[PDB]
Design a protein around this ligand. Sequence first.
Ligand SMILES: *[C@@H]1O[C@H](CO)[C@@H](O)[C@H](O)[C@H]1NC(C)=O
Ligand SMILES: *[C@@H]1O[C@H](CO)[C@@H](O)[C@H](O)[C@H]1NC(C)=O
Ligand SMILES: *[C@@H]1O[C@H](CO)[C@@H](O)[C@H](O)[C@H]1NC(C)=O
Ligand SMILES: *[C@@H]1O[C@H](CO)[C@@H](O)[C@H](O)[C@H]1NC(C)=O
Ligand SMILES: [Cl-]
Ligand SMILES: [Zn+2]
Lengths: 415, 212, 226
Amino acid sequence: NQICLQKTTSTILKPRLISYTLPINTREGVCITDPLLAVDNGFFAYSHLEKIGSCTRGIAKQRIIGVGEVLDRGDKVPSMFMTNVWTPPNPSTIHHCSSTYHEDFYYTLCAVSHVGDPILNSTSWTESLSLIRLAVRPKSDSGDYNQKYIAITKVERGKYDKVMPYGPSGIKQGDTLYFPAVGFLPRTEFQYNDSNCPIIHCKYSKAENCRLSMGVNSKSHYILRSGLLKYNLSLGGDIILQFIEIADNRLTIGSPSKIYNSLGQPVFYQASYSWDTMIKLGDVDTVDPLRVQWRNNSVISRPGQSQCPRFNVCPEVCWEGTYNDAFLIDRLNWVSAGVYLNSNQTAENPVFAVFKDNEILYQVPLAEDDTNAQKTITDCFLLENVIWCISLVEIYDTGDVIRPKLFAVKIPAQC
Amino acid sequence: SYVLTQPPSVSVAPGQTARISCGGNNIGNKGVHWYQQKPGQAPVVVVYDDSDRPSGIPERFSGSNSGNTATLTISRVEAGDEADYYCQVWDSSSDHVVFGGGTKLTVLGQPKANPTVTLFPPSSEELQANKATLVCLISDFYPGAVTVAWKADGSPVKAGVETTKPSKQSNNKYAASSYLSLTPEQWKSHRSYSCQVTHEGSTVEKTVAPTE
Amino acid sequence: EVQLLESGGGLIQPGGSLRLSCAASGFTFSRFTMSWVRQPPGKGPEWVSGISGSGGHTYYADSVKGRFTISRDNSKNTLYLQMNSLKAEDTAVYYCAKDGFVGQQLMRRGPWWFDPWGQGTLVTVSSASTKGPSVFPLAPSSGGTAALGCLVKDYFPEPVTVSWNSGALTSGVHTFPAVLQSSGLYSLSSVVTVPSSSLGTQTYICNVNHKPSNTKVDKKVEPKSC
Ligand SMILES: *[C@@H]1O[C@H](CO)[C@@H](O)[C@H](O)[C@H]1NC(C)=O
Ligand SMILES: *[C@@H]1O[C@H](CO)[C@@H](O)[C@H](O)[C@H]1NC(C)=O
Ligand SMILES: *[C@@H]1O[C@H](CO)[C@@H](O)[C@H](O)[C@H]1NC(C)=O
Ligand SMILES: *[C@@H]1O[C@H](CO)[C@@H](O)[C@H](O)[C@H]1NC(C)=O
Ligand SMILES: [Cl-]
Ligand SMILES: [Zn+2]
């Protein structure tokens, strides 16, 4: 665990394209969307949605959930080699999948909906959850070992009407799985004190802005609160799903999140989907109840719109932003690696960066200044004894399929 | 700072289908919007986010964006569609809203009509006030666009020229005027002055001489 | 329906200051980003400045930064533009413009577009003071017709009015729209096409009236003697 700890404008990062080993075929009017990436213990999980036509309004063609091994492909660069792919029969009904690795399998928790994205149709969505277990090293003659699908029926939600997985990847603790999740709570039941919304140095802010922006709109029936979905494998019997709400310290609207293992401890990231646009990440103080020691990070934010653009800090009623997580690679110096979008109000210009709380040590663009890019997911790991990070980046091809790309970036030990 | 480039003029006949261009470097990396501006009115959005159509806008107005050029094609074009069309994007390298120069869409409800040109030299009263103004009057041309070039003898002059925008006359044809402002010494220093009006590829020329 | 009503335009010398207002109705004013878009005469529109619904963020074009201020009173549903140290190139029609997007999206392909626009308010930055015209004759000497006229030169502001023989002559009269010169003064000509037969038997006088300066000039247009 040696990395360069000195800032430099030199380009010491050499990103490698590693999408060659994944089944992301390119065609005329095929769009690949809703991606997922997880990397754990030399294995990985991946998913996307193949659409025909519009990337946002198009018809669903195929959803894939696949796992496999991350291996040195032959030139000391890691790459993802799929071993086990599952395909659901109705690809338009599967939403918000989240993968967690545990003892030889990847557990992907998905939402089932026939009304579209539950976030954008909260009241019409009838809560329906399921789980698909994929073995990272398949066996012949094994029955349900390679693939197992289970519908979830025992759900403990607490005070929330509905719960749902909400993020790319989760973490295991012993034999209990934890998934990034969100609880739908009606506004009427939401306990929040206006005096707590920090407008002190915000001349144009109003006390009500925090409470209003906990839903996708001010008059939304529900507010969204992020949290965890808990599944204890040692219990057995009929599976029980348990929602754990996140603590109210630095509370923002429920947004896609990630809880992950780094150097032996759980770390959390939450997408900034409203007015608090500085990156939200940090070590988990307690898993249950869920409390995060958010970093006071002053250098990384996310693109928004005109009401809460990049670097906005003062409370407004806005539902804007992108998911751009970061991965802690050094807890002693609290250094992280991730891709951010270098644009104030549009999703473009992706830049892979290694940074502390108040300083970007080094970084490198992943495309041209103008290239469109939305979601990015970064997971880091050891390959032999070398530190690598793998970054999934949604990228738009001006010429052509608009699809995710995969980059491997080696983190230098020296400067 | 980002630059949007549009063709200055586009012509069709009534009910013909027209195509207007908005060019920018890698303009597929940006969301393009289109506005229509009829004379004497404020602009009106007809396309937003490359291809989306605002409610209240006829379906014949369609937008698309690819590579280095966005296109606003209008089918079943009509005399009401004669307006200026502007494309517009957001430049995230400058945090600026950028407009194109505009495209005059002309649909011709009239056969081509060449302008009548009359050239007036400076009068003696104005000359006695130590001033000199050449008056070139352009009338009865359709469609309503001309280009005026002045010449001192056979040599071009481009300073001291002011030309008006065309205005529609009461007979639905157009009129314009151009003024060449000269000092008395540069009026007398040449043998002849000419105003050349070019309308639809053809040029009409009128000449005046300082020596009466 | 959504209405945007601009006011405050007028005439001002370079280096002066004007304040524009825009009255908004038909929508919740504080939830939308508002902008000023200007159009110089004979050119396309140019984005000047914008402001978020709360006013927490203000945005300016480089050509305008440091001189103009965008602000907004949400209790009055009013958008403002304080233009200071005005230059001649600021002369234009200034529009109120409302962000046209409504809905819930996390990101927008085009985060700034306008629907609708106001009808605009005109701003003229000019050094021109009120001046009466100098009226010069355009002597006649094309078929069987002659062209004679009057040159109404270096006047400000518009309009002027031209008649021939105290309104007795209306046929064949063509009064051309004025040109705006470097100086900021206007010039126009009016020409009558007459039979050359009538040059020796009918008199032609143009009547030029410029009410702003209370100027009335009558000019007899006679054939020159070469
Ligand atoms: C949202 O749910 C409603 C059910 O009342 C229905 O219109 C449809 O399933 C959904 N609409 C959209 C636009 O997704
Ligand atoms: C999971 O269940 C077992 C009982 O089989 C219990 O001993 C253990 O503490 C539980 N773990 C969690 C995290 O709840
Ligand atoms: C961030 O700052 C707050 C307020 O000073 C503090 O309570 C919190 O512990 C800080 N977080 C870290 C990780 O230092
Ligand atoms: C983005 O916003 C910051 C302030 O939040 C500003 O300093 C920067 O210039 C903006 N970027 C662009 C390209 O205008
Ligand atoms: Cl509204
Ligand atoms: Zn000369």
